[PDB]
């Protein structure tokens, strides 16, 4: 798996060129803004439970047909597998946020996920909703604009981090879609 730094090394290797200014600058910014990132990651792993239960729960309240005899969330065993999948998904997203790369979310999570859902009969369209609420919940907990959760981190700009985590959420839906 790669991160922000080995991602540049991969791209610079393709040209057999040492890493210099152009590519070093941005990785220097990773460091500078690096403390914002660790908080960003912490805002996720600190409310990882609420985001998953809220997202699986929301996707069902809007589609009650899921907890119906014939729905993919019907029975305790299907509910528990879906909550677990949401937790796993939110976990790999959190990994890519700590690394500043999507390599780990796609290599170990989104690699064969949809096709997997095809076989089991797991609704990809509903899953894409669950992920959408998690993106909203996540996005809010990073900006510290959480409707209910209000922490005390020193104020600043985390829009690059929000835009980056949203992109990761977007490659999740894009993969099972």
């Amino acid at each position: 798996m790669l991160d922000a730094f080995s991602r540049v090394i991969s791209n610079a290797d393709a040209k057999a060129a040492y890493v210099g200014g152009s590519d070093l600058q941005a990785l220097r910014t990773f460091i500078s803004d690096g403390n914002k990132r660790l908080d960003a990651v912490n805002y996720i792993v600190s409310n990882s439970s609420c985001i998953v239960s809220d997202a699986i729960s929301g996707m069902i309240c809007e589609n009650p047909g899921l907890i119906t005899p014939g729905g993919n969330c019907y029975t305790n065993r299907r509910m528990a597998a879906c909550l677990r999948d949401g937790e796993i998904i939110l976990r790999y997203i959190s990994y890519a946020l700590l690394a500043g790369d999507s390599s780990v979310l796609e290599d170990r999570c989104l690699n064969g996920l949809k096709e997997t859902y095809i076989a089991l009969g797991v609704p990809t369209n509903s899953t894409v909703r669950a992920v959408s609420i998690m993106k909203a919940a996540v996005g809010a907990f990073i900006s510290n604009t959480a409707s209910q959760r209000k922490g005390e981190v020193i104020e600043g700009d985390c829009s690059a981090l929000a835009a980056e985590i949203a992109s990761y959420c977007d490659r999740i839906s894009a993969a099972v879609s």
Partner: peptide, 5 residues
Amino acid sequence: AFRAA
């Protein structure tokens, strides 16, 4: 089933 499927 993640591997096979």
